[PDB]
Amino acid sequence: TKYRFGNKTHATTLLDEYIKYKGEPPNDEAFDKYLKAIESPLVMFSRMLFNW
Amino acid sequence: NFIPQPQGLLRFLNTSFVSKFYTPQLQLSELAKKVLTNIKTDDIPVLEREFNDNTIIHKANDTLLKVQAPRMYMILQSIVLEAYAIVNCFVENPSSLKYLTEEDVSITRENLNYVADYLGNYDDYNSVVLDLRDLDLCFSAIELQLPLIKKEA
């Protein structure tokens, strides 16, 4: 709500990784991972019938 | 009851060296004069698409004859108006064909030869001359056939 970009599932994935790694993941990509993620049968019968 | 015209043709139509064989006279036909006034005053319908990439589309405007030889450019406009005028009546509203006469087309062909010969000097812009030569023989057929059409009709 307080920022331009918002999402539930994408943010939840970051939280799950953040929780599992106890807030100290091996790489800083996890913090920026959320930011980069967010910015016929009827036809066939009719067609073949026309062809014949 | 008029077909809408292209935007490019509408824009085009609404406004020393000398050849020894044929020369111009800058004379306008009576029929051509009437069509010019109608387009100038009445807001004729126009098209929005420009799919047809022929005639003046990227050939009459792309060439530098507009800025280099404006007097020659005036001749091309006169031929287009005369060419458009004769095509207008036969396709629709043939009542305006009465004003046309033999001398109207005779002067037009002489103008076409003069501008055509001048364009022959330029090697890059022979594409315009390609259509003019084909159009040149079209007017001659009308010149040798127009008197019979009016009497027949």
Binding site: - | F21, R49, G120, D123, N126, V129
Partner: protein, 348 residues
């Protein structure tokens, strides 16, 4: 060879006939001989012109056949279509796949069709679904309020309308763009240089408008797609492609590009008072927004190109354009791209 006009050929024929032991003959207008000579000269001029055109076409065809460099095909037009219902849906509804969207105006009879399934959830008075133009051409760049028909539509639908014009469909690849890309390829034959890395980055169809900023023992490439994003798979593909073209023994890196937003607040003067309307304002806004997009990286916000582009729609109808705050060109950094921006039209 050298182009020969009708008059020179006719003069040469007349000179040859006079010098060919023939004094009785005359070349006055209206004579059969003069007409035949003129026809022959016109035939020869036609042959020369067609020969020159065939030479140009053969040069183009030989350049195409030479090497493995060829132009890419056109892109199908696509956009967003808005649906308005009489009342919010009480229950979930399923749109059958392949639903056809068309219009009724004679100028734009082109059809559209959906590629993926969509569902209309209940308590939703509107739904937006992407569409694609079946015909490959610029005809899909319809103006605002053109697509107003839907096939296999239920009675719940009240209206069909597209909020913005597509302005995405394109014809075949332009000659100038193909020539420029070929120049990039020819300049990129010598590997281990800026141009080689440039061509290696630009050869992928998806990426567009990359920039290279060489540094001391460090190479940075700010690659982005037409949408300004950089997915991981496309980034890895670009890195793998550049690996062959990458100079040996030096670091390479890529970190996408950062977007910037500026509000132009343009104002335009229109000669025709009657033609002024909301539709023209929306068209101008869409044109300016599209011009903001599809812009490469590391180029200043030039205003001259903007005014010449917007004025290209109609030289006579559009009189003049002026701006309030962005008169001076805005210098963009290597990692900055001018894509976003809110446009407000203030007609005088």
């Amino acid at each position: 060879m050298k182009t020969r006009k009708l008059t020179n050929i006719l003069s040469k024929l007349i000179d040859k006939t006079m010098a060919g032991t023939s004094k009785i003959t005359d070349f006055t207008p209206g004579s059969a001989s003069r007409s035949l000579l003129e026809a022959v000269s016109l035939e020869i001029e036609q042959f020369y012109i067609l020969t020159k055109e065939n030479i140009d076409w053969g040069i183009q065809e030989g350049i195409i056949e030479a090497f493995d460099f060829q132009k890419r095909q056109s892109k199908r037009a696509y956009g967003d279509v808005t649906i308005q219902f009489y009342q919010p849906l009480d229950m979930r509804m399923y749109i059958p796949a392949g639903t056809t969207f068309t219009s009724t105006r004679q100028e734009y009879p082109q059809q559209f069709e959906t590629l993926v399934d969509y569902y209309a959830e209940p308590d939703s008075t509107e739904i937006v679904v992407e569409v694609y133009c079946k015909e490959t051409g610029v005809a899909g760049n319809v103006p605002e309020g053109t697509i107003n028909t839907i096939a296999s539509g239920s009675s719940l639908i009240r209206s069909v309308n597209n909020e913005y014009s597509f302005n995405t469909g394109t014809k075949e690849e332009s000659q100038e763009d193909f020539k420029r890309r070929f120049h990039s390829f020819v300049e990129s034959r010598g590997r281990a240089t800026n141009k080689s890395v440039r061509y290696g980055a630009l050869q992928i169809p998806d990426v567009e408008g990359v920039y290279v900023y060489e540094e001391t023992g460090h190479i940075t490439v700010f690659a982005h797609d037409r949408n300004g994003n950089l997915s991981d798979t496309l980034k890895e593909d670009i890195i793998d492609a550049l690996q062959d073209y990458r100079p040996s023994g030096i670091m390479l890196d890529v970190t996408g590009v950062e977007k910037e937003e500026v509000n132009v607040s343009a104002t335009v003067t229109i000669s025709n008072k009657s033609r002024i309307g909301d539709t023209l304002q929306k068209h101008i806004e869409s044109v300016i927004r599209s011009y903001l997009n599809n812009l490469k990286t590391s180029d200043d916000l030039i205003i001259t190109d903007l005014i010449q582009a917007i004025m290209n729609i109609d030289d006579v109808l559009i009189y003049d354009v002026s701006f309030d705050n962005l008169d001076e060109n805005i210098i963009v950094p290597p990692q900055g791209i001018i894509r976003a921006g809110e446009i407000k039209v203030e007609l005088k």
